PDB file of C-alpha atoms and ligand atoms in Angstrom:
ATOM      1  CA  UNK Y  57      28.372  69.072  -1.705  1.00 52.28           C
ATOM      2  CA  UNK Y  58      24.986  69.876  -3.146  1.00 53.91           C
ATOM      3  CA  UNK Y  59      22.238  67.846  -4.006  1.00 54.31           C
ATOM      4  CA  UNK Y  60      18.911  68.278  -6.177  1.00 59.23           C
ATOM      5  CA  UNK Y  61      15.782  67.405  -4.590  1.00 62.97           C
ATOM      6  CA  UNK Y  62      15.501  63.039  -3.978  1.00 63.84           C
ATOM      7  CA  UNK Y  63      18.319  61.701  -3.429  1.00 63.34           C
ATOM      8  CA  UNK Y  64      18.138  58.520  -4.551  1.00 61.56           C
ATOM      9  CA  UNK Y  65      20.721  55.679  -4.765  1.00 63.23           C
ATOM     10  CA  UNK Y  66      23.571  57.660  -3.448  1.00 63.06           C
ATOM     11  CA  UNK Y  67      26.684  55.237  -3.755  1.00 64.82           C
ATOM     12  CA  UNK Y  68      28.475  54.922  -0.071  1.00 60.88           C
ATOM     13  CA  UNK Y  69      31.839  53.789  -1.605  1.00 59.49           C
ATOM     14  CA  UNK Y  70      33.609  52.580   2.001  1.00 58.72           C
ATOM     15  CA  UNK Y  71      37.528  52.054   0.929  1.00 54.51           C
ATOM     16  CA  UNK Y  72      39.760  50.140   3.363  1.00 51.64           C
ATOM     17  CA  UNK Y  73      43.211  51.750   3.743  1.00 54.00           C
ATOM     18  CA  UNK Y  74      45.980  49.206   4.391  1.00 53.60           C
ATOM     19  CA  UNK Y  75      49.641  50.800   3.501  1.00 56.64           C
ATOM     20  CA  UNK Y  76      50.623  48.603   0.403  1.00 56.37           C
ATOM     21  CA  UNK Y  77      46.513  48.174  -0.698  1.00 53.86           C
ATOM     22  CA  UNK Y  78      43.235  49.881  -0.190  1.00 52.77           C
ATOM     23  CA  UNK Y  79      40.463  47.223  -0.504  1.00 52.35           C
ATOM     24  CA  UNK Y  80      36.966  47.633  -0.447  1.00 50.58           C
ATOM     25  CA  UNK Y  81      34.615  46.915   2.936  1.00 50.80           C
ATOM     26  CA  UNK Y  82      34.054  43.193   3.501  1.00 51.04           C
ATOM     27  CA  UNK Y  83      30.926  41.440   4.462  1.00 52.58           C
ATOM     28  CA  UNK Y  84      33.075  40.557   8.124  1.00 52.06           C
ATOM     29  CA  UNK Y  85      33.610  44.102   8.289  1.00 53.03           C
ATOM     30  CA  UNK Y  86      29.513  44.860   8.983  1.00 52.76           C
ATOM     31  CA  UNK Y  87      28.936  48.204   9.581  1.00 55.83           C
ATOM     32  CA  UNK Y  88      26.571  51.010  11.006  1.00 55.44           C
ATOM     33  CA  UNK Y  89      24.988  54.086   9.715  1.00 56.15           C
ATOM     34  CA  UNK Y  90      24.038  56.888  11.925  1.00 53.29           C
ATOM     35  CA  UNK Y  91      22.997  60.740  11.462  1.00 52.95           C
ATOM     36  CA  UNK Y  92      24.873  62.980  14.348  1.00 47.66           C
ATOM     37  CA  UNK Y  93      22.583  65.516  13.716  1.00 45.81           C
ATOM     38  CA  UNK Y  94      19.672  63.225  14.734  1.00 46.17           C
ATOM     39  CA  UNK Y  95      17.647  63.941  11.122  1.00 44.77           C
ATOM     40  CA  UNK Y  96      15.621  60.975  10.434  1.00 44.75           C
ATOM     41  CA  UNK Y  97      14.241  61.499   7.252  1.00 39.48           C
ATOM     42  CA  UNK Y  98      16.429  59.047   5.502  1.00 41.22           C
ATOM     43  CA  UNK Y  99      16.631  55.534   4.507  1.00 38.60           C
ATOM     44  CA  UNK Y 100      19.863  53.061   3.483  1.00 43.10           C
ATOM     45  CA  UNK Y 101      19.075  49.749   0.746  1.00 41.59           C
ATOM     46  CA  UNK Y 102      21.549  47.070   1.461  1.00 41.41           C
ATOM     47  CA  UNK Y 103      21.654  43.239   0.086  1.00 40.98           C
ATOM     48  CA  UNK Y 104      21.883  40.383   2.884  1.00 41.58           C
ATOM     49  CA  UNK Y 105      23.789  37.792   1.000  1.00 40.33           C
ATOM     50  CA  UNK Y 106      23.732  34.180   3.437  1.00 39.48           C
ATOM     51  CA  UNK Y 107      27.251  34.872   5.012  1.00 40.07           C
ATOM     52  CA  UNK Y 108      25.876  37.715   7.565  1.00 40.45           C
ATOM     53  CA  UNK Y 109      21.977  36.409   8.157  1.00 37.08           C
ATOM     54  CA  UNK Y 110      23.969  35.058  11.654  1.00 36.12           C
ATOM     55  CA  UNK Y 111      26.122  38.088  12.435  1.00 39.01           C
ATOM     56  CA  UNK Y 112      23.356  40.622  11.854  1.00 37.82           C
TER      57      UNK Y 112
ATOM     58  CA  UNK X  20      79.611  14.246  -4.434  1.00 40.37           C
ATOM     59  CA  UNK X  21      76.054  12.828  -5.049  1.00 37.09           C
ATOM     60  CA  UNK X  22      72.570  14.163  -5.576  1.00 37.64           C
ATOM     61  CA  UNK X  23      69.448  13.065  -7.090  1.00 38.89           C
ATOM     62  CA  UNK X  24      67.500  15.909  -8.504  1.00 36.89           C
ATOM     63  CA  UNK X  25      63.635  16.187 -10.171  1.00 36.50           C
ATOM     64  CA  UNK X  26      62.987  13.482  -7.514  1.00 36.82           C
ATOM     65  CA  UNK X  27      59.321  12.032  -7.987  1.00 37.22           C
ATOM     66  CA  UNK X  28      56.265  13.272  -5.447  1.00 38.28           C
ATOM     67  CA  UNK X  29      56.579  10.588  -2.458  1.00 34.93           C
ATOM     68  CA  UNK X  30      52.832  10.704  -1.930  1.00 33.17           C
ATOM     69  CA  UNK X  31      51.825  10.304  -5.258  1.00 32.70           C
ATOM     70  CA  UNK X  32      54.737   7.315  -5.811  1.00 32.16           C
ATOM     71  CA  UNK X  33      53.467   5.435  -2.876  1.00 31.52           C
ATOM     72  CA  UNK X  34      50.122   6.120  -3.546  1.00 31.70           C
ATOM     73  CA  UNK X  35      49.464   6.946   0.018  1.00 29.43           C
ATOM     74  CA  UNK X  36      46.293   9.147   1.370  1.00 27.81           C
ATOM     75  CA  UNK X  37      46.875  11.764   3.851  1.00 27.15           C
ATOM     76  CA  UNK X  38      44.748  13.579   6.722  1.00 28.11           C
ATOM     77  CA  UNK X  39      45.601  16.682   8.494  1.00 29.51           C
ATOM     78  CA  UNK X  40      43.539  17.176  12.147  1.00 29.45           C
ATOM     79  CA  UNK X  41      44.558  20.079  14.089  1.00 29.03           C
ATOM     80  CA  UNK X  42      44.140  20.120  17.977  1.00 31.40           C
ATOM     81  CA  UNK X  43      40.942  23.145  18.368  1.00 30.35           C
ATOM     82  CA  UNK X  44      42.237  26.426  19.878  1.00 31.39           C
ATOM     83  CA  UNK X  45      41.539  27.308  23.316  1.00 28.57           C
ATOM     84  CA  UNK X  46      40.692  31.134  24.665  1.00 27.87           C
ATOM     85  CA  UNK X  47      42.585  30.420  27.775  1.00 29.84           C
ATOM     86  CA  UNK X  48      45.098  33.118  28.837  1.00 29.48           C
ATOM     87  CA  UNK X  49      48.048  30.034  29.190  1.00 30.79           C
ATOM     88  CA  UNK X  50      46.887  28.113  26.304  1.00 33.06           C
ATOM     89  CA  UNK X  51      46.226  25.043  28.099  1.00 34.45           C
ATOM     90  CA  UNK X  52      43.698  22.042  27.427  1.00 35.19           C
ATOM     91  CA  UNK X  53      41.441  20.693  29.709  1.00 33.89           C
ATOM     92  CA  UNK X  54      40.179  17.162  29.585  1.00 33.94           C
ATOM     93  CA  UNK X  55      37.050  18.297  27.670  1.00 30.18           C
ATOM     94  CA  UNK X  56      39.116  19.934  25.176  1.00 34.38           C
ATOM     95  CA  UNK X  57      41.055  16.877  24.228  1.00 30.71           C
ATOM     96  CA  UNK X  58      37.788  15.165  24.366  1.00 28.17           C
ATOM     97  CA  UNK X  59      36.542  17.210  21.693  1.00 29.67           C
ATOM     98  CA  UNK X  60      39.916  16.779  19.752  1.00 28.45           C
ATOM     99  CA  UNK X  61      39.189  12.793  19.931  1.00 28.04           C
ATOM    100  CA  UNK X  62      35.783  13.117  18.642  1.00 28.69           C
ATOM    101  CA  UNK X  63      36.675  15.133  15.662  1.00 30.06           C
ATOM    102  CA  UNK X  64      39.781  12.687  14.577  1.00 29.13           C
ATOM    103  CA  UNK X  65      37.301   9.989  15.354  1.00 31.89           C
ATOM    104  CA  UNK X  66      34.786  11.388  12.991  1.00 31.82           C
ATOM    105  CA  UNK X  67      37.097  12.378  10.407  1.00 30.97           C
ATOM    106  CA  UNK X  68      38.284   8.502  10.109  1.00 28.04           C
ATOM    107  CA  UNK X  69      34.708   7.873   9.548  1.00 28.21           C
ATOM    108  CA  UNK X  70      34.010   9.821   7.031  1.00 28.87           C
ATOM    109  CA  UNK X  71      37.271   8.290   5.414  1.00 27.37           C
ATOM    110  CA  UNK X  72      35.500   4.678   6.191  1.00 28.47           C
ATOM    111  CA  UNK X  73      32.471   5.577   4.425  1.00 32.05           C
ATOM    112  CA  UNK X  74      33.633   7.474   1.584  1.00 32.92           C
ATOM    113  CA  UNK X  75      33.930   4.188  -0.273  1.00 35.26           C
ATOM    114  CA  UNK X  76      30.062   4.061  -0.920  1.00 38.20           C
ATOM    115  CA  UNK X  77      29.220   3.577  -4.496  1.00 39.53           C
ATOM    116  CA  UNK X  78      27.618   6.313  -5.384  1.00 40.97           C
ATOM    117  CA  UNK X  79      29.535   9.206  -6.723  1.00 41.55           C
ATOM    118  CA  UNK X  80      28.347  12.166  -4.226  1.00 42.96           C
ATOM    119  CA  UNK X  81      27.908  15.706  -5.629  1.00 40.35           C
ATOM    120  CA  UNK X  82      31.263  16.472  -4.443  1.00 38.85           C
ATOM    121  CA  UNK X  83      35.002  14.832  -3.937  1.00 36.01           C
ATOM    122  CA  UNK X  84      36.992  14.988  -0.644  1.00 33.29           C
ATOM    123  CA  UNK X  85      34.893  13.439   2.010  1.00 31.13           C
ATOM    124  CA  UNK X  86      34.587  16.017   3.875  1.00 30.02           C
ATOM    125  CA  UNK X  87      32.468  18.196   1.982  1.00 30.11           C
ATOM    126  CA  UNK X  88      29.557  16.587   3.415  1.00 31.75           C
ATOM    127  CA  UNK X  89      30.738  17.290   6.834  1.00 32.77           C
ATOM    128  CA  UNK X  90      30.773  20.775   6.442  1.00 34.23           C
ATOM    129  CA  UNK X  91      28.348  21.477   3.851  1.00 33.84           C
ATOM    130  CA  UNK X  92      26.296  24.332   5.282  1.00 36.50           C
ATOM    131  CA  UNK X  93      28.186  24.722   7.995  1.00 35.80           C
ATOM    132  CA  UNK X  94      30.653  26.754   5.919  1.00 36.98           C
ATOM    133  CA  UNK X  95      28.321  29.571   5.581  1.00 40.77           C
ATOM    134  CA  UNK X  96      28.589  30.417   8.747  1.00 39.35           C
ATOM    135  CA  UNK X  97      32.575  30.632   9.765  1.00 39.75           C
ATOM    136  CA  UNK X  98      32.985  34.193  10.089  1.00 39.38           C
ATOM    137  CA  UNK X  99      29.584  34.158  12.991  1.00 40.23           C
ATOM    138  CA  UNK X 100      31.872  31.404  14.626  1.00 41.64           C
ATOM    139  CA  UNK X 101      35.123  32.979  14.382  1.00 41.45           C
ATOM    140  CA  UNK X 102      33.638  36.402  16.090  1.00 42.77           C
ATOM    141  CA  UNK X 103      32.266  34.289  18.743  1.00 41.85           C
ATOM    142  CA  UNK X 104      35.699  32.994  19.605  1.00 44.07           C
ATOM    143  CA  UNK X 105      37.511  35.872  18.932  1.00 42.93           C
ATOM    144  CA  UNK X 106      35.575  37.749  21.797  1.00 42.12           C
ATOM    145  CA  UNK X 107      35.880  34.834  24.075  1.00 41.86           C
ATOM    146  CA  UNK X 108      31.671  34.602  23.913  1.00 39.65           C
ATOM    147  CA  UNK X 109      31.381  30.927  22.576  1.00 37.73           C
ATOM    148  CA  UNK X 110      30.461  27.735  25.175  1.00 35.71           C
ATOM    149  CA  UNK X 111      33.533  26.313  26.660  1.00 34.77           C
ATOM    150  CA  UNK X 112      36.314  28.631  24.654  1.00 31.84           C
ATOM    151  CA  UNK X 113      37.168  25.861  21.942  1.00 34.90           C
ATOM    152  CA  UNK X 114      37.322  27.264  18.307  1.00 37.09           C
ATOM    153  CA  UNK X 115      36.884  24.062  15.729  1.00 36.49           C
ATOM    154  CA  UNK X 116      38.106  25.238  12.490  1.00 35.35           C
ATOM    155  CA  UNK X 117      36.870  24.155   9.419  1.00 36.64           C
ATOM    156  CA  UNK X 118      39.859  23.533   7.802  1.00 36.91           C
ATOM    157  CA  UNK X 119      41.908  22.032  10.238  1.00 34.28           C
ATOM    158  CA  UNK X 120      39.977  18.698   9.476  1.00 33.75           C
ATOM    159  CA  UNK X 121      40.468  17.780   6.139  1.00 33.25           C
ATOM    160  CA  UNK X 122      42.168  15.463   3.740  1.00 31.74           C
ATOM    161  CA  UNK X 123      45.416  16.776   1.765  1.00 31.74           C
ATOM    162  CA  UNK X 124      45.585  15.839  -2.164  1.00 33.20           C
ATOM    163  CA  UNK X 125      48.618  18.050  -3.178  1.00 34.30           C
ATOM    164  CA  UNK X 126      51.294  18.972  -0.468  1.00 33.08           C
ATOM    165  CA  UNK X 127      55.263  19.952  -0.802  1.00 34.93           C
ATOM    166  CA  UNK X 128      56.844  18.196   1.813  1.00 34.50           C
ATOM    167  CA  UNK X 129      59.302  15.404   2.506  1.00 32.99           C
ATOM    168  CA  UNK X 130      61.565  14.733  -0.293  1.00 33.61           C
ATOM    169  CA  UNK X 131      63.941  12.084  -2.321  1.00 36.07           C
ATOM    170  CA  UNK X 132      63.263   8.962  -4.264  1.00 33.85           C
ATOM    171  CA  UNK X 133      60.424   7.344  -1.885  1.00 31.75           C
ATOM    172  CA  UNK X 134      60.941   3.668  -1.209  1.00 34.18           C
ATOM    173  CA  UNK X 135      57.560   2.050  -2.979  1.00 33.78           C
ATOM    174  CA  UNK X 136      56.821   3.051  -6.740  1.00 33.09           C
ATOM    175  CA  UNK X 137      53.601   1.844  -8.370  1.00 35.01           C
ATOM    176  CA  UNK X 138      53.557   1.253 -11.949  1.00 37.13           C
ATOM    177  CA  UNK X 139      50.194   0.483 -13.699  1.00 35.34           C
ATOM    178  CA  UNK X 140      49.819  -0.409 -17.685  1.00 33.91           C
ATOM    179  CA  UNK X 141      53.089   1.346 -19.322  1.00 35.18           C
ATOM    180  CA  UNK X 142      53.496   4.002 -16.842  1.00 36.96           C
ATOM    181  CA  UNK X 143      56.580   5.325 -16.107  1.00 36.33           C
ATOM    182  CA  UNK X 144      59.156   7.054 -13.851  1.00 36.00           C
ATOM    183  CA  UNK X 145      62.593   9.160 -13.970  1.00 31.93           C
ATOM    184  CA  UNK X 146      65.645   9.808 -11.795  1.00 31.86           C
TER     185      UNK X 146
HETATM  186  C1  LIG B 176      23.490  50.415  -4.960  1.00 29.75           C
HETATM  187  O1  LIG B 176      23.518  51.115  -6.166  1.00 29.75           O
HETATM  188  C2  LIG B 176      24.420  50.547  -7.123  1.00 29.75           C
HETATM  189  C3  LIG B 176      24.415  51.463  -8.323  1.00 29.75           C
HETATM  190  O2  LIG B 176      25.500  52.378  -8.293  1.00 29.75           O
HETATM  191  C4  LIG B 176      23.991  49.127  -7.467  1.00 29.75           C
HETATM  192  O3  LIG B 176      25.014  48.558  -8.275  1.00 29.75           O
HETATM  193  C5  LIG B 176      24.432  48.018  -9.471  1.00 29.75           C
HETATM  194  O4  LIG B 176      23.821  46.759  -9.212  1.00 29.75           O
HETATM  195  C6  LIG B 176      23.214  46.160 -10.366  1.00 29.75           C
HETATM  196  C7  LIG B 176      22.567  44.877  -9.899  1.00 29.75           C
HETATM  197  O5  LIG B 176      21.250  45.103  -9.414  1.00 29.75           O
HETATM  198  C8  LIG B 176      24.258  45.937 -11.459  1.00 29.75           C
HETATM  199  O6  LIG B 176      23.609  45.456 -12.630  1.00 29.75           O
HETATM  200  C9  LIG B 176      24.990  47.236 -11.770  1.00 29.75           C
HETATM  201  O7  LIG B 176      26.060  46.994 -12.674  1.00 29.75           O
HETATM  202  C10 LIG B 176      25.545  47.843 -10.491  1.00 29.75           C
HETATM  203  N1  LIG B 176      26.209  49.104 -10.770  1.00 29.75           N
HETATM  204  C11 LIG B 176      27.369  49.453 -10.204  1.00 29.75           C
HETATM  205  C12 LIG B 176      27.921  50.787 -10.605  1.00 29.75           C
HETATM  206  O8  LIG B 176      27.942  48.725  -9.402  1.00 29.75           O
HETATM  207  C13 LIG B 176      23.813  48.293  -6.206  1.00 29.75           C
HETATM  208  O9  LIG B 176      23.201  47.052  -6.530  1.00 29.75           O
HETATM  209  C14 LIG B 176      22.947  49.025  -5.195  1.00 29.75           C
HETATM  210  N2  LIG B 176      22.885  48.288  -3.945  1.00 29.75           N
HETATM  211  C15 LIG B 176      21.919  47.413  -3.660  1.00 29.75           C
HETATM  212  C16 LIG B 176      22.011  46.746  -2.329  1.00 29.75           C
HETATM  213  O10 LIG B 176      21.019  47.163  -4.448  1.00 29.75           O
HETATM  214  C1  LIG B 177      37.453  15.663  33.287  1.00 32.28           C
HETATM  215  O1  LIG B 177      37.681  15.539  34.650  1.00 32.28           O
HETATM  216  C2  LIG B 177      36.530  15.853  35.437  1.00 32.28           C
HETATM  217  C3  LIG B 177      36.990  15.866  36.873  1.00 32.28           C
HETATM  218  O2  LIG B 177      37.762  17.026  37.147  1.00 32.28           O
HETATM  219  C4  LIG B 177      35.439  14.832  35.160  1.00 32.28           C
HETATM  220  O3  LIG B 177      34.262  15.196  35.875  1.00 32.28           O
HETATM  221  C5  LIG B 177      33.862  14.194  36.839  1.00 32.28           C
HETATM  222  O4  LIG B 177      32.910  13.272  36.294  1.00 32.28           O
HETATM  223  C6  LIG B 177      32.484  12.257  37.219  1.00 32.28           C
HETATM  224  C7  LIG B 177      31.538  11.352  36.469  1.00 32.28           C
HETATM  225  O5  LIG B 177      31.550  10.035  37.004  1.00 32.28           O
HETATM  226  C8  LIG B 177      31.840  12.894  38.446  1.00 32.28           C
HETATM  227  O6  LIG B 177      31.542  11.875  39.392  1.00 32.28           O
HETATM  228  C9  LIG B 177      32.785  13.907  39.074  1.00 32.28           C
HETATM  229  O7  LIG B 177      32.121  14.587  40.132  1.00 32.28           O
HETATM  230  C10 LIG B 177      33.248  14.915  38.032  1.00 32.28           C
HETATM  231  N1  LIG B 177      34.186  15.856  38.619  1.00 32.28           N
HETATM  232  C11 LIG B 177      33.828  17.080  39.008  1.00 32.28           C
HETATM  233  C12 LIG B 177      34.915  17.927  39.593  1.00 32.28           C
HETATM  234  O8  LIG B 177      32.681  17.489  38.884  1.00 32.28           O
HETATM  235  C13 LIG B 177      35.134  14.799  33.669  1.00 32.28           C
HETATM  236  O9  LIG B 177      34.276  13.701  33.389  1.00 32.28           O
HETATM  237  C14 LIG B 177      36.410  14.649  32.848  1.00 32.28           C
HETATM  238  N2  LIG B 177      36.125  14.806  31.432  1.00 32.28           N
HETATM  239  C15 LIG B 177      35.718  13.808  30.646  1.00 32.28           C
HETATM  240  C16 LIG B 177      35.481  14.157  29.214  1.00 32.28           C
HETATM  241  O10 LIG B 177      35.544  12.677  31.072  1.00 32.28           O
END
């Protein structure tokens, strides 16, 4: 997939996969971002509602 | 034979108000309770009782069921205490549950015609 220059906002839609449903990523289910190719010229927006200030 | 059928709630008949307080869940391998674990349980039907006690304050309170105020922000925070159970990383290895403690308005339980019935200005039963 191709972009044009910025990319900004770029949607990471994470779908969980259980037989009879797919639902979508939980606040319990916190997750991690990380670039294999070691780029760092990235950034990720996310919203802290008050059900994770603890976990995170 | 006989049967009685569309019997009347028991609870609601008798007008009777009912608690529900869970022993808290150990992380021990065996699933036994020490004597600080039933400790624990003691204090938290203890407190639950109390809050019972004083719900019959005058004042309304923002919110029914007693033990709202109990929790109150405490319930933010359930899925922090869960993981630190789940993983076996929390103090002694108790879990207390939020809503093993609490009192029951609407169950489906034990049935037939209950003994007492309470009648109050031209209300009325059936059988
Ligand atoms: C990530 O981007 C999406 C856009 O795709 C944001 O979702 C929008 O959020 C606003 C609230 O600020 C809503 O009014 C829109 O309806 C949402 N759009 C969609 C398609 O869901 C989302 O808020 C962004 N994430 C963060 C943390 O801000
Ligand atoms: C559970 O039993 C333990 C004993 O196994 C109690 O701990 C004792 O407490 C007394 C306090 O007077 C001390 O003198 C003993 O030395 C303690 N025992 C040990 C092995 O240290 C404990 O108090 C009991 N739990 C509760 C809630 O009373």
């Amino acid at each position: 997939h191709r972009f044009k220059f910025p990319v900004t906002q770029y949607p990471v839609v994470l779908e969980i996969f259980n037989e009879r449903d797919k639902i979508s990523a939980e606040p319990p289910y916190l997750v991690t971002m990380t670039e294999v190719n070691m780029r760092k010229n990235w950034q990720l927006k996310h919203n802290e509602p008050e059900n994770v200030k603890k976990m995170k | 034979e006989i049967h009685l059928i569309d019997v009347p709630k028991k609870h609601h008949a008798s007008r009777t108000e009912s608690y529900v307080a869970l022993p808290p869940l150990v992380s021990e391998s065996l699933g036994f309770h020490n004597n600080n674990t039933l400790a624990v349980y003691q204090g938290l039907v203890y407190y639950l009782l109390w809050l019972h006690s004083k719900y019959d304050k005058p004042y309304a309170d923002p919110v029914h069921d007693p033990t709202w105020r109990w929790w109150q922000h405490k319930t933010k925070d359930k899925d922090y205490f869960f993981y630190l159970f789940s993983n076996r990383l929390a103090a002694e290895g108790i879990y207390i549950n939020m809503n093993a403690y609490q009192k029951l308005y609407n169950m489906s339980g034990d049935y037939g015609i209950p003994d007492l019935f309470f009648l109050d200005k031209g209300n009325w039963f059936t059988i």
